[PDB]
Every structure is written in C-alpha cells, then in structure tokens.
C-alpha cells in the first residue's frame, strides 16, 4: 500500500502579545511522529512516535532549528500579508502551510506537494510537476513572482523527490511494526427504533489502522446511499480509529440490510446483518 | 525530515 510524509504548520498573529502562536506537526501516513509548539517550554522539536526517538542529536538539533527558522518566516509573512491586504493591526490572522511526499506500494516516488493558506483560504500551491505555481490572488501573484525569481520550486523539487521520499523510506523501516502494521477493525451492529414504521441500524468499526475504510449498506445485495449517513472517521486516541455508518429502514424487515466493511487489514470484505 | 534551512518569505 502507498504512503506519505506530511508536515503541517500553523501560525496565528496575536496583537498585544509578543509573537505569533506557531504549531508544527509531522505525520507519516496517519501517525504523527513529531511536534513543536512555540509556547511550550522545551523550545525543541519533540518526538511523538517511538521510532523517531532513535534519531541522534544531530537530527534533533537540525529539525529543531529548521522548525524555529520556519516560524521566523511566518513572523515576516504575517506582517507582509496584513500589508498586501491592507488589514488592521488590531486583528488576529492565520498562516498555514503543508508540504509532503507520497510513494507507492513499491515505495517509489508518486508526487510531492507544497500548499499555503491565508485566513483558511488557498494562497499559492506548487503544482504537480514541482516546476510551477498557481496563485489564488494578485497578492499571491506578487509572491509567485518573488518565488520564481528566487528559484523556490527547484529546491522544493529537490527536497520532495530526494530527501523527503528518502526519509519516508527510512522511517517506514525503523517504524515497521508500528507503520507497517494493519489493525483490522472490530465490528458490531446496534438497533434502535425511530418511529412506528421506522428503525435505524448502525454498523460499527473500531480499533483499525490505518484510517481509510469504506463502510457501505447494501439492500438485497445492492448499494444503498439514500437515507445513509456516515460519521467522520475519528481517533480512538490509542493510535487507532473508529467509524460508524447508519441506515434508516422500514421496520420489521431488519434482515434485508447488509453492512459491508472494507479495510486493508481485511483479507475479504466483511458482511454484517442484524440477527435479533 | 523537514525541508530547510527555511522557507522563502511570502
């Protein structure tokens, strides 16, 4: 199965306190392994998965100065951006960045990405090809001109096709019993009546890794999305995930519905029917 | 491993 390394960065300006709040996290697939928070006391990149802990002091020193240096960039970006859009200095504003690498089942490179947002809207993004930018805006256009003039794309392309995909491989190996494990979902079904003529069936999936699953209700062997509601999949908190899928049915005939559970850790897709 | 030493300013 394919994999990704992604970093997420958020800075929020705060007029009348001294510095933007800055929070950085790194993930491989669905498992964070690093964090930094400009308000915490250590002022260091912190490990959040057992397999990055084996990296030595050079790596931690290096990751911590890159992430501080990154929050320094965002300090400048907040003031530039307020100027581009002529905004009041009285208001709090948000800069977000995320960049990363996917590789395929054969762990070769599939794609890199680098995206940037101001106040929760698209600003500029590096296109697939890693040579080129799209800009949401005329403010974003002048940044794009800045970035073309300074050959930002080139460095990012070398990072993403090189170091990044390389370090993803290295992590996949060191963390293999954690990153290369599948936790097959524990499933179950509940029934509650809604109305005279109606009852709801909720099909459960718990303790799975990774987060991708597809939950579908069939009716007599056939897809049923009319009156089907999936909740957002959600962290259990222990590194695993949870999702349920519900169907609203003409009651009496509970047995006519089958829940179908697909997940990487399931040799074969799973079928579930209410037996009372 | 992060891109570095640091990102270009907007």
């Amino acid at each position: 199965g394919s994999h990704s390394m992604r970093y997420f960065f958020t800075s929020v300006s705060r007029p009348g306190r001294g510095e933007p709040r800055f929070i950085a996290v790194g993930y491989v697939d669905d498992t964070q392994f690093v964090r930094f928070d400009s308000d915490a006391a250590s002022q260091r990149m912190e490990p959040r998965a057992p397999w990055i802990e084996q990296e030595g002091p050079e790596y931690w020193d290096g990751e911590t100065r890159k992430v501080k240096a990154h929050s320094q960039t965002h300090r400048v970006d907040l003031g530039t951006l307020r100027g581009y859009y002529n905004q009041s200095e009285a208001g709090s504003h948000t800069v977000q960045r995320m960049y990363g690498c996917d590789v395929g089942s054969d762990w070769r490179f599939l794609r890199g990405y680098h995206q940037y947002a101001y106040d929760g809207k698209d600003y500029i993004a590096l296109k697939e090809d890693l040579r080129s930018w799209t800009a949401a805006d005329m403010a974003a256009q002048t940044t794009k001109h800045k970035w073309e003039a300074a050959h930002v794309a080139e460095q990012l392309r070398a990072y993403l096709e090189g170091t990044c995909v390389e370090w993803l491989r290295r992590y996949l190996e060191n963390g293999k019993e954690t990153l290369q494990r599948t936790d097959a979902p524990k499933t179950h079904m509940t029934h509650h009546a809604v109305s005279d003529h109606e009852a709801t069936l909720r099909c459960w999936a718990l303790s799975f890794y990774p987060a991708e699953i597809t939950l579908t209700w069939q009716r007599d062997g056939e897809d049923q999305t009319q009156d089907t509601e999936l909740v957002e999949t959600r962290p259990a908190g222990d590194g695993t995930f949870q999702k349920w899928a519900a169907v609203v049915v003409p009651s009496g005939q509970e047995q006519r519905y089958t829940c179908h559970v697909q997940h990487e850790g399931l040799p074969k897709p799973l079928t579930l029917r209410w037996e009372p | 491993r992060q891109w570095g030493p640091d990102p270009a300013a907007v």
Partner: T-cell receptor
Amino acid sequence: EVEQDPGPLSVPEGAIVSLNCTYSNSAFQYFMWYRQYSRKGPELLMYTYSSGNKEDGRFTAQVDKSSKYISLFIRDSQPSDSATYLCAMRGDSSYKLIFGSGTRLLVRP
Amino acid sequence: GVIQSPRHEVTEMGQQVTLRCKPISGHDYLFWYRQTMMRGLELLIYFNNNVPIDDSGMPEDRFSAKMPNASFSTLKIQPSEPRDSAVYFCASSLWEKLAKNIQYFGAGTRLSVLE
C-alpha cells in the same frame, strides 16, 4: 570535519592548478569555494549544489558525493590568482558553513 | 556594505572587548565568524530577524552575541584572553542570496588580546 592541504602551492603562470578537500559527514549538500587575498575577506567563487561539475571562465568546481571529495581547477593560472583558497559546505538544516583550513596558492610571474 | 568596528583592537587580556556590526540595510540574516590566522573561518553564530538560529560555534564561556535591533549586532568577549586573537568577520544576507550561497562580508575586526 573538512580536510584540506595547506600547501603552499607554488606554480608557474599558465599552469593548471588543482585544489581540493575531503569531508566525512554525508549530508553536506552544498559545496563552495572562496578566494581570500592576504589581509582581506573571503570572496565567493563557485558554488555547486550536489551537482557534479560547474564551469565559469578559467574555473571549474566539482563534487563527488560518493568519495566525499570536492575540487576546484583553475586553467591558465595568473599572478593575481595568488591567494589562499578555501572550501566550505553545509547541509539543509542550517546556514552554518564548515570551512577547510585553506590552501595558499602562489602563481609565479 | 556591512560595516564593522573597530577595524582594529589591541588590548590586555582581562578586558571586555566588544565588536560591532551593521548589516546591509534590508538584510535580515547576520553572521559572526572568526579566523585564526592559520586556517579557515568558523561560524560563531548567525541570526535571522534578530533571533539566534545557530549558536553551534560559540565558545562555551566568555562569548555572547546580541542583536538588539535589525541594524545592529554585537559580539562580546569578557574577559578576553590571548587565544581570542583573530580576525572576526561579520556578514549579512537575504534568503534569495543564501539560496545561491551568497553572503556579504564586513572588512573585519582585527583583534590582538595580549598578556
């Protein structure tokens, strides 16, 4: 660490000069050469991002990340090329440069 | 370009020595180096927006560097010692020049701390 022979090299004008450095830390990714006249500051010459070979005028700089070995060649050397030459390098985590100790070059008129 | 002072300092060990640097207007990175007249430079420290980024090369003890505002940096030695004699170079740049490995150097402070 960056090992560099101190010399001095003394060469007759017109000669091809070869200068180099070796290092031990893989993850050095940017390699550079500086020229420094005596009593002055270092002046950037040539700069090669992991990228083998880089020609400019009489100067060519090269990098072999396998043998961790780096070189600068100066064709048709001249008296004004007389200077100490220093190699410098970094990775991608800091702008901190590590220099070799320099090679003093004399080109005899 | 970058302006340093003093260009020259001769003093007795024991004394506080203070070196100063004004980067090129607009440059938001600044570097302090030292060269002991035998070898290559070493980086002592650099700053980005007046914040110290890499400190690696600062001596464990009698050395401290400040950047109270964007146009001004100091390096302090207290007390000074003969092994401190060196040419101290300041330099500054911008991202777009550092991505091509270019920085701008001051003319240097030449320091002899004598016994």
